[PDB]
Amino acid sequence: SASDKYQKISQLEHILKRPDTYIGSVETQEQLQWIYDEETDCMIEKNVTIVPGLFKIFDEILVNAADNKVRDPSMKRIDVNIHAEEHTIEVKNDGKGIPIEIHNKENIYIPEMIFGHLLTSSNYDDDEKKVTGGRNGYGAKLCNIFSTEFILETADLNVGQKYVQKWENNMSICHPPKITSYKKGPSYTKVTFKPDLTRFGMKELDNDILGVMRRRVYDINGSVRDINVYLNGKSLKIRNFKNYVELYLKSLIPTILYERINNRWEVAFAVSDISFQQISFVNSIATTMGGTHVNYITDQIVKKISEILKKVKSFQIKNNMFIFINCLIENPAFTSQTKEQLTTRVKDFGSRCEIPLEYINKIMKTDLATRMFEIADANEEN
Amino acid sequence: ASDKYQKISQLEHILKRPDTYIGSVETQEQLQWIYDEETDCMIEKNVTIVPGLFKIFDEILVNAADNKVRDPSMKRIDVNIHAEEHTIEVKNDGKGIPIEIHNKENIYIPEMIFGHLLTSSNYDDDEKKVTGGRNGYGAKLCNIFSTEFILETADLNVGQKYVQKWENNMSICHPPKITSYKKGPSYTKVTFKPDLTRFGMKELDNDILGVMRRRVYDINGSVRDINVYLNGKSLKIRNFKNYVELYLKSLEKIPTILYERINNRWEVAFAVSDISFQQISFVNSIATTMGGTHVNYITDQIVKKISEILKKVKSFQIKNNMFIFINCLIENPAFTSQTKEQLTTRVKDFGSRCEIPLEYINKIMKTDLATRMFEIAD
Ligand SMILES: Nc1ncnc2c1ncn2[C@@H]1O[C@H](COP(=O)(O)OP(=O)(O)NP(=O)(O)O)[C@@H](O)[C@H]1O
Ligand SMILES: Nc1ncnc2c1ncn2[C@@H]1O[C@H](COP(=O)(O)OP(=O)(O)NP(=O)(O)O)[C@@H](O)[C@H]1O
Ligand SMILES: C[C@@H](CN1CC(=O)NC(=O)C1)N1CC(=O)NC(=O)C1
Ligand SMILES: [Mg+2]
Ligand SMILES: [Mg+2]
Numbered sequence A: 001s002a003s004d005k006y007q008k009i010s011q012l013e014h015i016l017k018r019p020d021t022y023i024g025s026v027e028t029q030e031q032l033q034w035i036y037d038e039e040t041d042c043m044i045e046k047n048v049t050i051v052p053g054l055f056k057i058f059d060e061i062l063v064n065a066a067d068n069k070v071r072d073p074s075m076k077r078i079d080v081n082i083h084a085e086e087h088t089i090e091v092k093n094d095g096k097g098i099p100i101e102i103h104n105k106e107n108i109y110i111p112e113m114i115f116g117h118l119l120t121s122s123n124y125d126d127d128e129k130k131v132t133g134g135r136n137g138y139g140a141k142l143c144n145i146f147s148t149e150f151i152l153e154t155a156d157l158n159v160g161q162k163y164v165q166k167w168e169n170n171m172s173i174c175h176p177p178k179i180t181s182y183k184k185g186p187s188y189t190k191v192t193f194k195p196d197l198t199r200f201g202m203k204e205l206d207n208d209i210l211g212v213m214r215r216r217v218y219d220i221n222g223s224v225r226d227i228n229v230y231l232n233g234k235s236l237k238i239r240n241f242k243n244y245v246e247l248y249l250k251s252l253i254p255t256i257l258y259e260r261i262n263n264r265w266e267v268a269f270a271v272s273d274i275s276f277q278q279i280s281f282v283n284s285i286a287t288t289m290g291g292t293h294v295n296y297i298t299d300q301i302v303k304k305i306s307e308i309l310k311k312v313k314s315f316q317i318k319n320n321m322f323i324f325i326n327c328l329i330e331n332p333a334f335t336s337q338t339k340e341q342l343t344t345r346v347k348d349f350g351s352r353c354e355i356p357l358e359y360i361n362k363i364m365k366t367d368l369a370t371r372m373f374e375i376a377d378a379n380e381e382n
Numbered sequence B: 001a002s003d004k005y006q007k008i009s010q011l012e013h014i015l016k017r018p019d020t021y022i023g024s025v026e027t028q029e030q031l032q033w034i035y036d037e038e039t040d041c042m043i044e045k046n047v048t049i050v051p052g053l054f055k056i057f058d059e060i061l062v063n064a065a066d067n068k069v070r071d072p073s074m075k076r077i078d079v080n081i082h083a084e085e086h087t088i089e090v091k092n093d094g095k096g097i098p099i100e101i102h103n104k105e106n107i108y109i110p111e112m113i114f115g116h117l118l119t120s121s122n123y124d125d126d127e128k129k130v131t132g133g134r135n136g137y138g139a140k141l142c143n144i145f146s147t148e149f150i151l152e153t154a155d156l157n158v159g160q161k162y163v164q165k166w167e168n169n170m171s172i173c174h175p176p177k178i179t180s181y182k183k184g185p186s187y188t189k190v191t192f193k194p195d196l197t198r199f200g201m202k203e204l205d206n207d208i209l210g211v212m213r214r215r216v217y218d219i220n221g222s223v224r225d226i227n228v229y230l231n232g233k234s235l236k237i238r239n240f241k242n243y244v245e246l247y248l249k250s251l252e253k254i255p256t257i258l259y260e261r262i263n264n265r266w267e268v269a270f271a272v273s274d275i276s277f278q279q280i281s282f283v284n285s286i287a288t289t290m291g292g293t294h295v296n297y298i299t300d301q302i303v304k305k306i307s308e309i310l311k312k313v314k315s316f317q318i319k320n321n322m323f324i325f326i327n328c329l330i331e332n333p334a335f336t337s338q339t340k341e342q343l344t345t346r347v348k349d350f351g352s353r354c355e356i357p358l359e360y361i362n363k364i365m366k367t368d369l370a371t372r373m374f375e376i377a378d
Helices: A011-017 A052-071 A110-116 A139-145 A207-223 A241-246 A292-309 A314-318 A357-363 A367-381 B010-016 B051-070 B109-115 B138-144 B206-222 B240-245 B248-252 B293-311 B315-319 B358-364 B368-377
Strands: A029-037 A042-050 A077-083 A088-094 A147-156 A161-168 A178-181 A188-195 A228-231 A257-262 A265-271 A277-282 A321-327 B028-036 B041-049 B076-082 B087-093 B146-155 B160-167 B177-180 B187-194 B227-230 B258-263 B266-272 B278-283 B322-328
Touching (some): A042 A207, A052 A077, A052 A088, A367 B368, B041 B051, B051 B076, B206 B240, B206 B278
Antiparallel strands (some): A029 A042, A161 A178, B087 B187, B258 B266
16 A cells, blocks of 8 residues: 555654664664773773663763853863662753743743754854854753653753753653742752663663763763763762873873873873774764774874884774874764764864874884884885 | 754754765765776776765665665666756666555655655565665655756556656745656656755766766666666676676786675675775665675674684784675664664674685685785794
């Protein structure tokens, strides 16, 4: 039947039917993932089985909180509470909350608009060059859509009110907001959600997902300047990106060479054991598939090393490198909503990052150089 | 606050933020293969092209190839590129689009599936399908990025012909012209004029024309039992081995290419790479230029065995001497994005397996790859 064969569906129906291009796979995946080990106080690489979409909806909320540091530089604190037994996750940030006002076009409260309707954002005017992670106006709604319960709480000092709004059943139930007088306290936003574990094929939050979620909170402390992050009330202790990269020290002439190149670029280098490795952040987004920023940095290092060597194949140099990058890119573009891979051309970054000769010279003091010299005179022998 | 926060439509968002739908609408400097007509072979060239423009064309091509999955009686695809008039025509035979009013939507079906987002015949995954179409965007994405978009189709069930024109990024939809058709065969024809200025272009230059043309050779290579015509010329690629062999001259510049059909859903070819790892792969006729799980599945098998042989050197040394070609069929595939450049489907969900025979890996151990690896080892 022609009418049965050709189907039209709503955008909301499509998201639930086909999560992949919105939040990534809802099937279990075997992955090698970095985990923060509390018994040894360091990052360890572990074979885990996780559902990427579940990890992603958490990440969407985390990155929104980090984005608030950009809009409000006075923001000091992010709290992440994971209540595994209760299947609830809370992310709270201080600094400016959400305006408690009726939108003069949409005729609803702004928090209801931007957490309860697709395609809503403060990031749609690209005349402003912004270094927020937020771009498309989907993130928070995707979390809501994949939650059985989703609660937004915010306090607005301009009106002196607190606003609490609950959605249920994959954003399909939207309860009216509870608005109360709020005097003589700080602004903040708190997002609480209970992921719809049925849609992720799970019955509980297991040790693998909790492990990667917790590490992602370390990432946030590592990548966002001048904030204090707490996990279930406990300080993560690290204060900057250098401290973050140092958590990898045990698993990795200094082992780690770190440099802030400018106010938008920090780079660290270590020698890799097996092959090319990268850990990179764009506006606090974890770019696990790398992209133009990673290639920009590594190409430079490879080119400069190669030139010193010729005075070997490029993949030979590259694959002895473990690179860490924390960068701020203007109005970035990615291959997908998950933002695993940056596609912004270098000329559109809004900044440059030239790696200085002094840094390259320091790399030439590491095992990387020894390994390349071996390849080199073997190539001469033949 | 009201000005700080905005709600936009799906259609506004696509034009505002094309990247997750069709890829970048900015120029990209790329190494790309093109078919050199004078030498009758593939040549690697530095080009500057806008991926989104290449992609809207690819959406229409793969749709035509999908019609061969749906109707195995289909025999030909015609592509006509009219560079001067920036017009592109893609015609296939076999079953057309049903000229019926939809039960629910109350409009003609072709209007529905070419002129409204989120419309598809691929939404029911109870059926295990080997089409490339998955999400119900591709054809609409082409329409949206066109100044003018024309669907022509004829169905023999009703004995009619249906012609409908959209304009101005799909915003103008003209009523269909439906006429009596007792004439020849069923067919569908899509004619569009890309909104070139939206891609920052004045005209279809030689770079984009070269990759568009190569992509048509790709289709002939990856899809069996069809004739493919480009601007009137029969391409006549016999099979996937013939397609791979188009790369022979540039690679040759112990056979140069080792080809094997593994089974009915998997074909692989191998050549030695001079600079780094290279792959050309297709999943259900989609060009998976960013690879993914199928490429990893094949290369891991090869690298793992060669590693054991050398052990009797790091895995990256082996992999970076490989040029792999893969043509495969995957059930209900999943990708990272609408552009379908990277497959994410797990091997266990493929619908088939591809165990590379040890004698094939033995043939690989006769090439320059082994000589190079043994010099690192010994
Ligand atoms: N913790 C927060 N504090 C302040 N504003 C927030 C917070 N979380 C979300 N927002 C606002 O809500 C809007 C919607 O969030 P979101 O759905 O994630 O879209 P986005 O961040 O703009 N883009 P994207 O994440 O790429 O889909 C954002 O644009 C912010 O303006
Ligand atoms: N040349 C064609 N012949 C027959 N049917 C077609 C043709 N092109 C498109 N269709 C039909 O039109 C629908 C819409 O096409 P399209 O927008 O490209 O979606 P899709 O191919 O199903 N999914 P996707 O391409 O992944 O976004 C398809 O599902 C097909 O049923
Ligand atoms: C790519 C688009 C959604 N996508 C669904 C799909 O399967 N194909 C499309 O073209 C549209 N995306 C949704 C989202 O979460 N964020 C965006 O920016 C647009
Ligand atoms: Mg966001
Ligand atoms: Mg399609």
